[model samples]
Target: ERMILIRGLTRVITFDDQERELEDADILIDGPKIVAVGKNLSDRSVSRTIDGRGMIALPGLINSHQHLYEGAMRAIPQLERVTMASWLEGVLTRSAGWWRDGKFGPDVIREVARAVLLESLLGGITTVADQHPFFPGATADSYIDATIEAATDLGIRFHAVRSSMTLGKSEGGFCDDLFVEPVDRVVQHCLGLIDQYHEPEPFGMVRIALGPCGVPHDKPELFEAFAQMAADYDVRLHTHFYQPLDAGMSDHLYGMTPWRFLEKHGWASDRVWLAHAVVPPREEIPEFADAGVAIAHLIAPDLRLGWGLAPIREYLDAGITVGFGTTGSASNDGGNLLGDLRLAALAHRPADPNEPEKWLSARELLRMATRGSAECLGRPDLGVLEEGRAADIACWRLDGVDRVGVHDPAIGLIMTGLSDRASLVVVNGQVLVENERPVLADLERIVANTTALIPK
Candidate 1:
């Protein structure tokens, strides 16, 4: 660990109590922390320097929820022929089938997990809250260890979600053998994982959270246990919520709507982050805010799957801390965080009589991807470039011919820039990506391996 300096940044973008967008300023870094951020600041401890001229520097993007192993099976060809429930049924059956046949072994899991994480890093995503799937015959730690191994080797900040589920088809639940286990057994493993892997430091590279598969897959007792486990360990809770109206909306599951079920069971809180939240009722938006629940607005892919639009702007307008995740590759086909930021703003524009307040702006979208995501992960130490914060930064090349006439750097980066990878991406004061390439891993091998696994 050495002291470094980022000098003469063309533009430095950061949001605190007020926005700090300085031109030709410099940033100071010592080890894995940012020590100073200002202009004409002279320091004696400069071991290395990044000449940040002709580039836009800002906080690196954070992906609140993603499944890294789903990268190889992205955009399944036959996904359209079936309904959402049918799609899920087939996917689960195949997972259990693989387990029984010993087809998807630990080796395969490691390969796919590594490849997708590398892809995430190249796209300027510094932090990812990854929910590793529970494959049949796979031990509680196997799924998570594969992802954590890849994230550690690649130098990406990681939040490995320890997901659990007990009830299965025999219990009238919708999943296959993959989700079968005793509720007590699942909770104990989660507790073990927290003790074994969860990191507590603000700038720690790796942390673990608990994610229980939602209502349809697990019994309410499991969720209650998950909530208590997370609270005792002092980590975040996440789950698949409001993903489908027909499957999850049925009163048979909980005697109420999916959201209402969550509230009834005492699962809704600031400690949790729900995925999809597909088409929440407009009237209950403020109520969700009142409960302090967060949403992983998985937008672009949800539209591709014909899941109805999430009221993204309404969530933001209601003072709810809304973050964005492009979601798993199986849904979106790519984990381009910057590309999703562009879509986050463009996709949510009101159709008629656009209200000025609710219109999602480029800056607001950026804030969501960076600041809002950090908040959801309960990590306020990240996603901002002020002094004393982690040195997780992204620098984009605005001098490229396609972006020559950049009026506003943030706006132009979101609206006009074509490249997904920043010219340089840094985390923990270490340059993990420079010249638009990964610094610590064999990217060529990763791409080759992942491509070979994809269906022909």
Candidate 2:
């Protein structure tokens, strides 16, 4: 082992989900990976060292289903009511303005991602799978150029799903077809992204996935075609599925119930992951479970959209792997990934299980924030910090008043609102947070820049 030792008094949360409160454990991190993690190995030959004191270390936090670009939209003022339907409607009117006159303008690539993504870094989001509505008009607004540059600059793992459409409003899209790019172009976009990004080996810096918007926006032909495209490229696929709160949605767009419709299109595969799999026919659970389709259970969306209690229990009982996420800071407007974790478990509790066992189990919920989220990414290497896993990690100081005598650090995070500051952060063996502060840039400046851009 090309050894590097980190000497600390912090508790080390290991692979078994057990936290060993150690006075001093020497964590060995070799070049770009963890070598081995045995306590008190300071005697080994080491290349680098970090003095960690009064801290707790665990696997890097996984923030699945965050719209990183939407960091720019952090508090847009329209308090009417934000659902997927209304959110889409508002963006339709403002997106052109977001590019034409807003900060991103024509060259929206490097500005906020460098600015906003760093906020995510300090927030302890080591890996983010971000979604965008097909920007990059006039040559400067494309998702790829902006995301790659920002991720590179900030040094975080990023999965930029090329989420777009080929079916348009004229073609009877629930959304305007102009928002939809051409069908042929959509295929080319995916293939081109694969050639450009989409890393498969563990801890690869960037990956590209095909993002068909959902049943609402896709025409039958386009939906079927993208399914083949996702498999042909041998990459993951995702879409918004079964968030049915509105009238005339499925009938106006897809003719079948959400799951059956996607299943028919060959879109629901082991390689595919669906967002907001909130509603499902009782009989379909077994079929989906047998098929190994992944579901992202966004708890905040169900509450905000007024769609109560999705079949989360059935999905989990069927052995479906699910992760927790809020729709967006702009949509939820205030809560974050940690908040979403609590919401997810509690939402399932009143019906899925009893309050005592289920009403906010921190350890279990923390897993959803950590390892469970990593599983949803279809990448085994992320979300955990063991030998050979990607070196994405976060540390919060347990000595603080907010976290004194927490009994169990891991449990404290979930049971109480342990969604506080992280003392240290490392992604891919690089230290992004040092001594409870960012190393590369100023946190206040990034927030200031984004604040200046919020629509009045």
Candidate 3:
């Protein structure tokens, strides 16, 4: 039933349900379900169309956190001015000792997860997640089947977070003891990667979560067995919370306080989603917004390792659910979720410049990188666009020259200047990027085979 369409003149931003935008639109899709978007649609039989004029679409940018096997450990000038415990002992224990001495395998983690999911689909990012905590062998399902075979050969829309690290540095944690593994072999390799790659339908393009790389590097029975295997496989749960050295090593080894050791084990509810929730305790930020926890707010590796600002406007005025992450390429060395949605719409304007209505605009940081990263990857059918959802759009152009005369094409596609790429993206409904390159692979042979598998 493959169809495609796109068409029309400009603007679309349809973060749906009353957040519409439309002007001269079209959309359609059919195959991976967009079905129709507005203004002049009906014209069936298609295989491809695209030309959305001066462009602007939206809805495909969800990164909700990443680490793509530290993608050839980006920009490591000795991890520029270190200190999140010396950049986690120089980037996750020297890249988990190059995947436990075999010098990085699974085809160099599938060419560094296909050169960072093809630099996150030429910077438009179509659903990522990643969080893979370097499990060097004794079965990590071949490095999670080489990052779900490089997000199923670069079509993107992945989530693979099997991640775990059974507290290494001889147990004080930070990884090293052959990149730690035995919490019952990381819960039977996260139940055989959720019965071989959990999808949970709705335009499914690979999904599976359970992160565990938190507190003292994981072990409160791997956060109470990944919160009982995410409520017996309803899937979805990630890790790394309160990042000030994992909330001061969870109050120096369990004297309670990393949200009370994640609410004493069952990882503080709402099926979870936490990464760099920078330093909690603003009176527990309303107990992570009444335990429905979900905060992947990474802000350029917490302003490149100082780990400070993450009040994220008091976790979005205490309702929590914030999302957006570029964390890991050795600390945000670029996977650009629209350049971290223009540095989270201008880094929270001096924390509160006499209440500029608590800032963070630019369409609320592009709806926290698309519907708060599709509700931190639980994918309520993915970040909006209407009619059955999941077509995973994204367009861009706006008469180029860095968004010429940007009047509003969706806040000049995130405060203009430096949107990086994307002239078209798509995803579930295909078109794997167009004008701004990458139609399946070979972006200079994926940056010279991920720079010849890095770690020289």
Candidate 4:
């Protein structure tokens, strides 16, 4: 097996069981697993060796929720000041509308996916759980295949969600009729994707989950079917939840809260994680924790869309697992997970002057991005750097100008670093980015291709 050695790291933040932090560390990668992590490893034989001097290594960041195919819609001026509902409509019209109108195809999907995935890689995100549900008036297989191909070629760990939207506007749903699929067809498509891509092995590079766009956008039957399929296949389930309008719409359509509707449909389980969740009542936080349901906190997107801060303190106090997400390109405009981590750390100052401990620390936020996000994706094997763990590591340069006078480089990563790009990133024991640049794909070509496909 090919091996790579990262030697002389200034600090190695291992988010293992004990949460150990090593000074002047070395990480040894064997094939797809980390064999050793410490100072002066005994075995020095390897295919390649990386100089980790002046750098801090952490468990690779995980984007627990994303829409990789939305790269073509980044920074849509028309969506600048739109409401949540209008933003959703605008994104769908560009994605599904363009697809149905024959303006989007598999090539476009591949290009967009590559651009976003590349962006994520440079930003130190080694694993991405992409909630891609934009197949309109076409079979989902081709689009999903193209996305997976791009991910594979890029050498990043991918959790490709076979997401669906089955409730049409005519039936009180948010999306256009053309974008919604029949319930049975959606289930069958998910089944096919699961059979084709769902990997249960510890170190597998690709995995699949089931995500139906969100409440009100999908019918109860679709949620039920997805939950059952997830149970049957032992896969995870994902969807959007309380994104401002969801509560009112859930009350209007189902006469209950969003969480209650989810529980009624067999979705409130450990394997289920919802996105946004900006407005879940504080009373329901414990119930969600008890159900083991997790939330993918989209801090940047939430703030960008004027969605209020997710009661993160409440969630943490309730012992609920909260992971980080950048959502889609148009909503967040960039795939910079590290930058979002900074935002998460600063965004939640305790309202009370005396309860300073309630604030999220840089270390706590880093843990959330790594281990917490892994749990959200049901990937216990990921998000940690230790012996026998998957070899997904991100190394950031700490000696740069922006890091000058930063006493604690590890903590300063979130609080001080101005650049979002990582110096080096390795996924599944493979080096995908080095010296703050992608090693596998031509990023310039990707950007140009994706720019060409963006709607005017």
Highest-TM-score candidate: 4
True lDDT of residue 123, candidate 2 = 62
Residue 30 CA displacement from its true place in model 2, Å: 1.5
Model 4, residue 263: distance off in Å is 0.8
Model with the higher lDDT, candidate 3 or 4:
4
Residues 64-127, model 2: lDDT tens digits: 6766555556566673367666777776656655655654542354555666567666667787
Q: What is candidate 4's CA lDDT for residue 351?
A: 48
- Where model 3 places Cα greater than 4 Å from the true spot, the runs are 1-11, 14-18, 25-50, 53-56, 70-102, 105-110, 122-212, 218-252, 261-273, 276-285, 289-294, 297-318, 324-423, 426-432, 435-444, 447-456
- Pick the winner on TM-score between candidates 1 and 2: 1
Note the Cα lDDT for every prediction shown.
Answer: 0.78, 0.68, 0.81, 0.86
Task: Put down candidate 1 lDDT per residue, 156-260, tens digits, no spaces.
Answer: 899988775566777777666656777877777777777878888879888988787677767778778777777777888888777765344347756677777
**Sequence-dependent TM-score of model 4:** 0.96
Clashing pairs for predicted structure model 3, backbone only: none
Model 4 CA deviation exceeding 4 Å by range: 350-354
**What is the C-alpha lDDT profile of model 4 across 1-456, one tens digit per residue?**
878889999999998989999988899999899999999975556888889999999999999988887787876789988878788878877776677677778888888888889988999999998888866655654778888888998988998887877888788877777667899988888788878887789988888898988887889998898888888999999999898888889898899999999999999899888898898888888899999999888889888988867888788888889888898888888888889888877776744457778888888889889998998988888899999999999999999998899988778999896698899999999898999988878888888888887655
For residues 1-456, could you state the per-residue lDDT of candidate 3 as single tens digits?
868888894888876667868787888887787887888886768867777988888888888888887877788798878867778778766766776677788788788888888878888888888877777657654877788888898888888888777877675766667668889888888888889888888888988888887877888988888888889888888888877766667777788887788888988888888887877779988988898888878888888887667777778888888878787778878888887777767876877878888878888778888898789777888888888888988787888686778788877777777656887888888888888988767789778877877777
Deviation (Å) of 203 in candidate 4: 0.8
TM per model? 0.94, 0.89, 0.35, 0.96
Task: State the TM-score for model 2.
Answer: 0.89
> How far is 100's C-alpha from truth in model 2 (Å)?
3.8
Any idea what lDDT model 1 has?
0.78
